[PDB]
From a paper:
Here, by combining cryogenic electron microscopy, genetics and biochemistry, we identify Balon, a new hibernation factor in the cold-adapted bacterium Psychrobacter urativorans. We show that Balon is a distant homologue of the archaeo-eukaryotic translation factor aeRF1 and is found in 20% of representative bacteria. During cold shock or stationary phase, Balon occupies the ribosomal A site in both vacant and actively translating ribosomes in complex with EF-Tu, highlighting an unexpected role for EF-Tu in the cellular stress response. Unlike typical A-site substrates, Balon binds to ribosomes in an mRNA-independent manner, initiating a new mode of ribosome hibernation that can commence while ribosomes are still engaged in protein synthesis.
For the Balon-bound ribosomes, particle classification revealed that nearly two-thirds were also associated with the ribosome hibernation factor RaiA (state 1), whereas another third did not contain RaiA but were instead bound to mRNA and tRNA (state 2). The tRNA-bound ribosomes also contained density in the nascent peptide tunnel, indicating the presence of peptidyl-tRNA. In the mRNA channel, density for mRNA could be observed within the A, P and E sites, with the P-site signal showing a well-defined tRNA–mRNA base pairing that corresponds more to heterogeneous rather than a specific type of tRNA or mRNA sequence. Overall, these data suggested that Balon can associate not only with vacant but also with elongating ribosomes. In the absence of a P-site tRNA (state 1) the lasso loop is poorly ordered, but in the presence of a peptidyl-tRNA (state 2) it is stabilized by contact with the 3′-CCA end of the tRNA. However, when Balon binds to the ribosome, it sequesters this N-terminal tail using a unique loop (absent in other aeRF1-type proteins), which we term the bL27 trap. Therefore, Balon binding to translating ribosomes preserves the catalytic site in its inert state, inaccessible to water molecules. This finding explains the well-defined electron density of the nascent peptide observed in our cryo-EM map (state 2), highlighting Balon’s ability to prevent premature release of nascent peptides by translationally inactive ribosomes. By contrast, we show that Balon has the unique property of binding to not only vacant ribosomes, but also ribosomes bound to mRNA and peptidyl-tRNA, illustrating that ribosomes can enter a hibernation state before terminating their protein synthesis.
Numbering used by the authors:
A (entry chain Ba): 1 to 44
B (entry chain Sn): 2 to 89
C (entry chain Cl): 2 to 273
Amino acid sequence: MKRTFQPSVIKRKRTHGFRARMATKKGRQVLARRRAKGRHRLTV
Amino acid sequence: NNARLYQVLRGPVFSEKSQMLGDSLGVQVFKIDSKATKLEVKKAVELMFEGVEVLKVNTLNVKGKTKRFGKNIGRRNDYKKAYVTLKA
Amino acid sequence: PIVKAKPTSPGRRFVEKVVHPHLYKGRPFAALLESKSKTGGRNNNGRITTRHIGGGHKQHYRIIDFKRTKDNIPATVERIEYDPNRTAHIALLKYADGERRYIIAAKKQAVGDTVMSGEASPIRPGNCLPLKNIPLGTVIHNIELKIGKGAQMARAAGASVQLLGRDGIYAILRLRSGETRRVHVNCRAVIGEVSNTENNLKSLGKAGASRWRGIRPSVRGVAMNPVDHPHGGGEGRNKGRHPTSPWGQKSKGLKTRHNKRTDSMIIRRAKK
RNA sequence: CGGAAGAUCAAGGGUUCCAGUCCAACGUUAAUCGGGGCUGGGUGAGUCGACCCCUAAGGCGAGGCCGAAAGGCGUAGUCGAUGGGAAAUUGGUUAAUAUUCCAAUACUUGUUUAUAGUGCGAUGGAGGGACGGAGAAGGUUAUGUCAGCCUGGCGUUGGUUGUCCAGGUGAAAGGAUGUAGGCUUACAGUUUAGGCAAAUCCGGACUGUAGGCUGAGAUCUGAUAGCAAGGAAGUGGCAAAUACCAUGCUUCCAGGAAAAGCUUCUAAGGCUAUAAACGAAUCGUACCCUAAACCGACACAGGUGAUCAGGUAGAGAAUACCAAGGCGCUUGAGAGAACUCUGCUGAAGGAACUAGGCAAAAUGGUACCGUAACUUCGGGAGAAGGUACGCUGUUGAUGGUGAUAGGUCUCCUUGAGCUUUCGACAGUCGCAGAUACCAGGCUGCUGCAACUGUUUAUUAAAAACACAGCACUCUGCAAACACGAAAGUGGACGUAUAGGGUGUGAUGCCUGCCCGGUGCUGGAAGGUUAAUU
């Protein structure tokens, strides 16, 4: 049957990407948290 | 400038497609700089192989293959190659 | 007038359509047109603030000249058109200088006759006059409330207002709501009753016809659960409470009028 | 298998593509094989797509508004495709790319130079772009089929040099042309309460004078292309799309994007023809894509948008069998117990089964005849129920196309060949002719809900919800009401024939009594009554 993921690159980069994170104060806190944990993947 | 055309051509391509094209249509296949345009390839070839005139440049980017080694997953460089047709 | 559909289908058995053979069959005057996209009854917060709004046909906005300030330049009625944005018909006006406008078509307004705006204008359907140059007792529509703002009251299909009298700088009007009100005598009104008087005589016939107009279905409060509506709950059918809105506001007589600044402009209301 | 299990994409993936090599692990078995390991290779564009120009919803938003802070909103603008905007087709070629390479023949749009003429210029004005549902009659082509022609064949078994058999064989875009259709008065002059200024442009008002635009297709050219056995053919009939004419036409109401490119006009302050030479960057292009490569933990019976659409039957994109093409679904070998699953047949009986005809069996097509209660006059209804149906010969009528003649993409008459649709008569075979696949079971009484619809994704599809219709009530516009802290919004660029809330729920006949209680509405004489003082 139809499953939950249903990928789309435009939608992925527009809802989770680097610019979408950087465009809000809370997304920048997401990025700061990821950098402090040391993740090799910042954003989708 | 002239110090940019020296770095445009990175090396000839030695393969069966290359050899067939050189034998049949007299076209040269080069590995070129990843940021090089068709006009710079024209100028570079005509500059560095004196006495030849370029007819057409066809270029393409080819992605590098993901080749593992030991416990790692690496990948080869991307690169750009040009097909250069010459006035015979 | 009204025409009944033959009961060829159960969805056609109760269709009573308003039919006007004299309305323009062509397209509206494109210069007086604007794009207009649906809201779904959602505001700038994206929340539904007006329920039961959704879908329907695409429609352009026709720019209606509610103000009528091209005074003392006669206009001829080029055509009478259907307007998807309102219940009334709209008359395309062609002024002596060639400028075209849309106005609300009066009931007794046809193609070819000339309308006038200003103070020295005949008392004929379609003419726009300040309320002080309008004799008492004539039927008017498109009433201004502020001077120069444009017509606000009596604009729907079949609308009419009775000009009862004058008590100084105010004109006394009887509205279709049964409310006697005063309006500044320098405000304007248009002579005649608004066209399409058999609007409320029509019958949609089926649910799809209501959907075509952008009206989504309406779920009764007693058909819900108590977490949704004050009327929700109950084993079987039950009301249990005084009627209220989904926000707890009584719906059976409770008056909801706050405006203390406009209170002195209202003479009285009718009790039936 | 073949409206795919074939082919082209998009999305998504990312090398899975091709070759060589290897078989440990992976592959539900083995594997010499592989979408596995390893090593090489492979994606070529002015015309395809993106980028680019333009904008929709919706974002962000100099200033501005609002808000303890954080922030929220919003104007000018600036982004944002799923939409608008320039242009190529046939053939060949690789192991793997091809509208990209090669060949042939095209097209679009620029820069520079030169020759002439010469008022050019916009983010602004006006045009244009530019648009809905349904339906119908045509004209076509793609395509098919037969023929013609070319090349081979004389058949393991009666016959097969013929009215025989098989295979092959039809070049596009473009340029001319201007057809079937569709639309449609044209010009000149004067003047101007308009198009925010201006206008020679549009709009308006006056006066005389009397085929054009678009357009499928066919035709000509393109065109001595390419294509097999080793050097061949290559043009006629008929049928025919859901594609094209057609963004047409006709109708209807629920009344049908925007902006730019483009054509014109001017405002503040180069352009038009002729060519000649020279350009058209960058990014994608492999491969899967009804899937073993995407989403489902798997090489998972699920899901995944669009495009193409051969033959014989057939109404058909159903169905059956085939073509092109692609596959045999990654354990096999036996045996032929019980029992389980999936099917087929069944004496006599025929619902006795069971909670219940659940399941099964049965019906099933076309034409014609015939068809009850009741009804809102539409229906019910395909009610019910009957008859015919294959093939062969003869024969009547008839639609289309139209060679040949008689009187220039033309018209009129005759009409060969091909083809369509209805009959009649006579015969003939079988148990059976709608012979397979395919393909309504029907009826009587009664409860409920008017009906089409919607719903508990994953045990409930209903009598539940919705519904058109009805009523009550609120709401005079900065409306009531809703979101929000507010600014700002929706309601609505609506205006009481409107909008909100509530109940009820087509329609027919209708809807009695009670205002004590609790609400709601009106009133204020009296009693009580806050901060405050």
